[PDB]
RNA sequence: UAGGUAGUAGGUUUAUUAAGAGUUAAACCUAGCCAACGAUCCAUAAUCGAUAAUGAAAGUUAGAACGAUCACGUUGACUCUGAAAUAUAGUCAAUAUCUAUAAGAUACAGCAGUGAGGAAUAUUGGACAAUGAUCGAAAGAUUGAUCCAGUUACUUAUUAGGAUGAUAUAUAAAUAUAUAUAUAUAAAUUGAUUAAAAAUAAAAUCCAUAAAUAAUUAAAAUAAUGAUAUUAAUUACCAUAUAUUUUUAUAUGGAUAUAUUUUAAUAGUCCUGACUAAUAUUUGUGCCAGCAGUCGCGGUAACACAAAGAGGGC
């Protein structure tokens, strides 16, 4: 059984009620007014505890749940003010007690249907420093920095990336007045990162889940047969997982263990370049039966899947 | 793409990626997802129609279709049974919608480089968005991890800044800004000490949420926090503003106005040339869509963002952001694998 | 690439458009017996001139030509057998030999 | 299609490769004994047995192989001018470069072909002697008894 | 319920359903027949498209005036 | 070109991107029909140099795949290559100023980097 | 379709061929050979893929497009040349047409195009610039192969505008920085009298890009040659220098009146009783008119017919 359902709001509100004939309002519209309270001449919603950021490091994500549909504080006092019959705001009758205290995580949790969503730690810009400088100067790999501050290996390698980006910027005075207020402001409205925290810290133990092994397997082995995960590798044809982690661990362009040699076997030939030539011809060489493009291969430029690549140049071209 | 029509429409209660005011009172009120006495088919309905609304409306349905993949992807912690705490089950069917996050345009919405999806299609399309220096101007380009990608600060800035008004619309709010100061200033002259009085119990009750009382102690230190009869001597009456006379002068009307907090500039056009209100101020109702991604690295300072990997999901928690619980992105994902049958 | 320099077959750029044919004699208004024109005009430049495709072809070849030393003589263009083409030469033949010879 | 599976994935085909040599060559030992070795009679033989006529008409044995010997190939095929001649014309010139290097590419492809054959053919014998012994050592590990062992109940005596 | 004998150009004769409130066919009149039966009238299993050949759209058609051979008012 | 054995291209790809397969063909079949046996693939079209590169001193590259080895057995065996085909093998350094003719001779053009043999 | 076969099954020899064999021809012998696991006969059909469609898969379907193979070039047979042809050749005959009336020529299943048939499938286009093919010592010539464009939503893909936005006036002393601005007055489209909406929808405001305009200009191709082509792309007075992932920024030479081209945004179609997503109601019709994939709907409160409002798909 389902029927179409204006989404009315969960929590009481006031109704309309009778109506001059030339209002023409609706109930959706008078509940978006009692949320967003009075607009003043600015066109300032100062009533509704949402129009304006936090500046404290706490995220003020919506709570309509445990506030009840109230919406509404003195924008200054910040203490809860609600709708009474005159038409009047004034304080409540009784005290809210579930915004009083309230869960770390649910701080965190913008969305109230999904608790499995939380944002992100922003890093202070005294730990970005403290990261470029050690992989840069010191001359430390990602991996030791990494499990240092508890900051997985990319978000390390991506730090040291920006860095060398705000450098640029500030040495050619590209970060104006509106960019740095602007920053300030959103990092005011995040929780900081910190290293030491062990909650706050992030796992540095993940692998990617293979599909193969994604199945179920068991074996009926004797009842004191030792059974590890080295042997479960071996039965799953896989390395094992410590090795995927550590292997893992070296893909940083400054983490250790990065090597790229094995490849450098492919003979290449630049043919010579003449005054007045546009182009160079390059040569690689190749293996008859691997090289071309096969006959009769399968068309898909008239079908829901053809193939859509961008060039060198981010144009859009067909594959 | 799609055509955007009632997107923000208060009865159908649809909650949308974009910071806009009708879409957070539809998100406030929207008290999760009804699947009670349907039919698997009409919760499988409502899950797709509730999940599409926010993650790629804009794309067609069939387009959707051949984008959409089966295979989720999550990750092993291998310290897990190392810890001894309660392990927590992984949100694998939150999964569904992650192969849009590799998106341009969804990563400048993650990165809140756009105010919305709608946004950040039209920045990348007229030339703002740069990937690895490239100039990128197809909104499905897909990010691959380690891949960076920058915004013109300008377009970040009117993005998250409030709207610029126009002359008229803040020459109004100026001759009103005249009119209660200089009823401020009738009422410091007429009783001053009950004004300084009201405005020490003021400051009381700022609890550091307004910094105006940082900035008031140094006011108190510019002249024991004693009454002072130079105060309501010094205030002075602003002259009223004839919005007629300096209608369509700019300049003029810019040099008759000056306030103690709003000098020589109308309100909002401290700098006329710039797409924004100035001062820069944030949008209203930033908060609640403020969320930083855990795929994302980014800097502010130079409005640029680095797509660290695709989403993952791991034990008690899904990077893919939505305002959906994981019942109705499984059944959107029922509904998905069996093209709707 | 560079101007050549005038020969004695070939002092202006009127004998140069008798020389290599093909009707190119009708462009000496075009040229306006302008050296340094007809060995630094391309092909965009002679289409907005109103030179059609073959002609500014058969020139550009030309003055390629000239300007390595090698022979500009008019090559004429292939022509159908008297009898016709290959294709309908039978047909033709018969008809034109039970009307001349019967 | 599901077809491309069986081979890749790959859609469309290539050519088949054509073979440089198109017959063993005199050097692949291995093959010229395998052609000599006596060949099998009864129920897994090959042949017409001692005392059965074969066809009348028709040959009773198989024909030889044909082995190539590559030093012969070379010389019938790509041989060398007999005489150092005389190229002053420009024609001549070119003509002469064009075969010695026409020769000199030939030869390279019959002896590098040769080569990788014999190379190949050794390879697979240290390749399978490994295999072997490595077959042995991963059978002799499933042999050793371990201490679980006896948690199997066993009726070695019955 | 108004039906048409129909000889198609193949030889074969049929019973063919003519839709919509009104029509205007007549002996002679070219129509084109698509397939679908009329369930409560026996023996006759193809319709007639509305808007073809001489057969003309349903007059004053509002919805569903693609299925009737209706052309979009001004 | 002459000869039943030839080396020339084959024509891929879609309308106005065209790409080629370098091939060992019968000189009697069509230009797109199955070979004798697939040598490499060209890419007409120059990678594009963006501005500081081009400044900096870079040129543009023409991609050429080409199986080194078996290109010089059909050679030898008298396959006949094409024009096209032919200035390729002459840049790849297969073919040498023997098969340059009177039009394309470079006698005197200066080079301005020479070819070079390397490992990637 | 139950019996079929009579060079038929096998043996021997000659002829013929580069070559085996009742493959063809000649001779002489044996009585065999096939068949209810389907012979013989009849009907139908070009075959297939690392191609397309579908499915979890085994499979099933197609055989247009890409590629491989076969056959044919109005019909039949025969011959010549040749390594290879019962050749799109030649010979004779058949059918049709034509003009030169000859033991004549032609046969569009080459391209374009026309009539016919059909529910239904396009230009009597451009160029040999590219890749090939033929001829030539070369210069070069030829090429409806081929490359391009035209026609056609037949298929696929991208784009086809974002942020803000529920009213308008009057209103208020005569710079330690204010601040929950507050009052009146008028206006307020369809539906409806409250969970009944249409509706942030519209207008309006802010900011853009496309196109245009201007300059510039690759690449397909080089020794030279560009059909496509009014090229793509880029830049927004043009050029230059310096610094300057990108990019940015400063300053310069010339260029206009301290500033510097202009500037957008009108979707259709089906559906809302159940299967099956569609609750805001209302009018007409009255077992009629009509709807219908299935169950069924319609006899005066029709959620199903015909419509308005509202709503759901794509
Ligand atoms: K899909
Ligand atoms: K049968
Ligand atoms: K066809
Ligand atoms: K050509
Ligand atoms: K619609
Ligand atoms: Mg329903
Ligand atoms: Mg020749
Ligand atoms: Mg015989
Ligand atoms: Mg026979
Ligand atoms: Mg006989
Ligand atoms: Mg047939
Ligand atoms: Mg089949
Ligand atoms: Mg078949
Ligand atoms: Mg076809
Ligand atoms: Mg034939
Ligand atoms: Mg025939
Ligand atoms: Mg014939
Ligand atoms: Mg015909
Ligand atoms: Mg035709
Ligand atoms: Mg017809
Ligand atoms: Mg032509
Ligand atoms: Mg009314
Ligand atoms: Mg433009
Ligand atoms: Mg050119
Ligand atoms: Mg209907
Ligand atoms: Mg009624
Ligand atoms: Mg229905
Ligand atoms: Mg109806
Ligand atoms: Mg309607």
């Keep these: 059984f389902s029927r179409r359902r204006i989404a009315y709001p969960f929590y009481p509100f006031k109704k309309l009620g009778r109506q001059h004939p030339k209002k023409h309002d609706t109930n959706l519209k008078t509940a978006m007014r009692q949320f967003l309270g009075p607009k003043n001449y600015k066109g300032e919603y100062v009533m509704n505890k949402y129009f304006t950021v936090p500046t404290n490091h706490v995220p003020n994500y919506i709570k309509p749940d445990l506030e009840r549909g109230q919406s509404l504080e003195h924008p200054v006092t910040k203490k809860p003010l609600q709708l009474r019959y005159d038409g009047t705001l004034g304080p409540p009758p009784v005290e809210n007690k579930r915004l009083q205290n309230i869960f770390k995580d649910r701080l965190l949790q913008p969305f109230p249907s999904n608790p499995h969503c939380k944002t992100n730690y922003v890093l202070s810009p005294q730990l970005k420093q403290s990261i470029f ?187 | 793409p799609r ?70 992807d999550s990750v092993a912690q291998l310290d897990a049974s190392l810890r001894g705490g309660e392990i927590k089950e992984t949100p694998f069917l939150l999964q569904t919608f992650a192969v849009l996050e590799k998106r341009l345009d969804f990563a400048l919405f993650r990165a809140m480089f756009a105010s919305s999806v709608r946004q950040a299609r039209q920045f990348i399309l007229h030339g703002n968005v740069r990937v690895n220096g490239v100039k990128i101007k197809h909104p499905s380009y897909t990010l691959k991890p380690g891949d960076m990608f920058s915004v013109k600060p300008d377009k970040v800035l009117e993005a998250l800044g409030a709207k610029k008004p126009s002359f008229q619309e803040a020459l109004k709010i100026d001759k009103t800004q005249i009119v209660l100061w200089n009823k401020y200033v009738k009422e410091a002259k007429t009783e001053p000490k009950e004004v300084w009085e009201k405005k020490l119990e003021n400051f009381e009750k700022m609890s550091d949420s307004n910094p105006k009382k940082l900035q008031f ?61 100035t001062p820069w101020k944030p949008r209203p109702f930033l908060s609640p869509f403020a969320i930083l991604p855990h795929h994302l690295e980014i800097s502010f300072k130079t409005c640029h963002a680095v797509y660290l990997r695709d989403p993952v999901a791991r034990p008690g928690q899904s990077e893919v952001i939505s305002p959906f619980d994981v019942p109705v992105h499984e059944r959107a994902y029922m509904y998905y694998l069996r093209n709707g049958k | 690439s560079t101007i050549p320099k005038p020969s004695d077959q070939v002092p202006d750029v009127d004998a140069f458009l008798n020389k290599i044919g093909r009707n190119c004699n009708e ?48 090559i004429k263009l292939g022509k159908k057998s008297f009898f016709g083409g290959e294709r309908k030469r039978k047909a033709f033949t018969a008809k034109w030999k039970a009307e001349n010879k019967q | 299609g599901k077809g491309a599976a069986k081979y890749g994935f790959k859609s469309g085909v290539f050519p088949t490769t054509r073979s440089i040599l198109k017959s063993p060559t005199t050097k692949q030992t291995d093959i010229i004994n395998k052609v000599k070795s006596p060949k099998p009679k009864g129920v897994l033989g090959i042949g017409y047995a001692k005392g059965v006529k074969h066809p009348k008409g028709s040959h009773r044995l198989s024909p030889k192989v044909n082995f190539i010997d590559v030093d012969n190939l070379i010389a019938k095929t790509v041989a060398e001018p007999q005489s150092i001649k005389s190229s002053n014309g420009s024609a001549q010139k070119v003509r002469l470069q064009k075969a010695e290097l026409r020769r000199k590419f030939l030869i390279e492809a019959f002896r590098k072909e040769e080569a990788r054959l014999l190379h190949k053919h050794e390879y697979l014998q240290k390749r399978t002697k490994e295999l072997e012994k490595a077959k042995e050592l991963e059978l002799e590990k499933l042999n050793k008894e371990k201490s679980s062992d006896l948690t199997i109940m066993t009726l070695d005596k019955m | 319920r108004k039906a048409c004998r129909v000889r198609l150009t193949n030889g074969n004769v049929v019973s063919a359903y003519i839709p919509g409130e009104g029509h205007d066919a007549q002996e002679h009149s070219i129509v084109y027949v698509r397939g679908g039966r009329c369930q409560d009238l026996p023996g006759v299993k193809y319709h007639v498209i509305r808007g073809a050949g001489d057969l003309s759209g349903v007059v004053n058609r509002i919805s569903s005036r693609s299925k009737y051979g209706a052309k979009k008012p001004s | 070109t002459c000869g039943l054995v030839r080396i020339r291209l084959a024509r891929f790809g879609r309308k106005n991107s065209p790409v080629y397969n370098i091939v060992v063909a019968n000189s009697r079949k069509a230009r797109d029909a199955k070979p004798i046996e697939v040598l490499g693939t060209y890419v007409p079209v120059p990678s594009p140099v963006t501005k500081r590169e081009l400044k900096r001193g870079v040129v543009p590259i023409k991609d050429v795949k080409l199986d080194f080895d078996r290109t010089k057995y059909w050679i030898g065996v008298g396959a006949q290559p094409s024009e096209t085909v032919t200035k390729l093998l002459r840049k790849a350094g297969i073919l040498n100023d023997a098969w340059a003719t009177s039009k394309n001779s470079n006698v005197n053009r200066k080079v301005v980097f020479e070819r070079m043999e390397t490992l990637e």
């Design chain 3, 27 to 74: 462009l000496k208004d075009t040229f306006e017996n302008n050296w340094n024109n007809l060995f630094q005009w391309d092909s965009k430049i002679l289409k907005e001139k109103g030179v059609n495709i073959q002609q500014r072809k058969y020139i550009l070849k030309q003055v390629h030509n000239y300007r390595n030393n090698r022979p500009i003589h008019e």
């Design chain 2, 3 to 72: 055509k955007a029509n009632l997107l923000k429409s208060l009865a159908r209660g649809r909650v949308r990626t974009s910071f806009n005011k009708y879409n957070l009172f539809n998100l406030y009120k929207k008290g999760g997802v009804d699947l009670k006495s349907k039919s698997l088919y009409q919760q499988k309905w409502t899950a797709k129609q509730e999940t599409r609304a926010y993650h790629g409306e804009h794309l067609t349905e069939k387009r959707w279709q051949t984008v959409f993949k089966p295979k989720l």
């Design chain 1, 133 to 319: 400088e050690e992989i840069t100067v010191e001359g430390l790999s990602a991996q030791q920095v990494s499990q240092k501050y508890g900051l997985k290996i990319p978000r390390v390698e991506a730090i040291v990336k920006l860095v060398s980006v705000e450098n640029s910027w500030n040495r050619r005075n590209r970060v104006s007045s509106d960019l740095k207020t602007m920053d300030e402001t959103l990092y005011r409205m995040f929780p900081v990162f910190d290293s030491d925290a062990s909650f706050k810290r992030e796992n540095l133990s993940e692998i990617p889940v293979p599909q193969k092994t994604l199945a179920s397997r068991f074996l009926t082995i004797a009842e004191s047969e030792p059974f590890g995960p080295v042997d479960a590798a071996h039965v799953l044809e896989l390395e094992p997982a410590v090795e995927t982690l550590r292997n893992l661990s070296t893909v940083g362009e400054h983490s250790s263990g990065h090597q790229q040699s094995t490849n450098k076997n492919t003979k290449v030939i630049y043919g010579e370049l003449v005054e007045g030539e546009r182009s160079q011809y390059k040569f690689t060489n190749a293996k008859v039966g691997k090289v071309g493009y096969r006959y009769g291969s399968g068309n898909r430029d008239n079908k829901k899947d053809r193939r859509i690549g961008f060039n060198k140049l981010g144009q859009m071209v067909y594959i």
């Design chain 2, 217 to 277: 102690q140094e006011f108190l230190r510019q002249y024991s926090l004693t009454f002072d009869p130079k105060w309501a001597k010094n205030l002075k009456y602003h002259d009223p503003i004839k919005l007629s006379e300096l209608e369509g002068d700019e300049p003029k009307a810019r040099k008759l106005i000056n306030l103690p907090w709003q000098k020589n500039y109308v309100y909002g056009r401290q700098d006329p040339k710039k797409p924004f209100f």
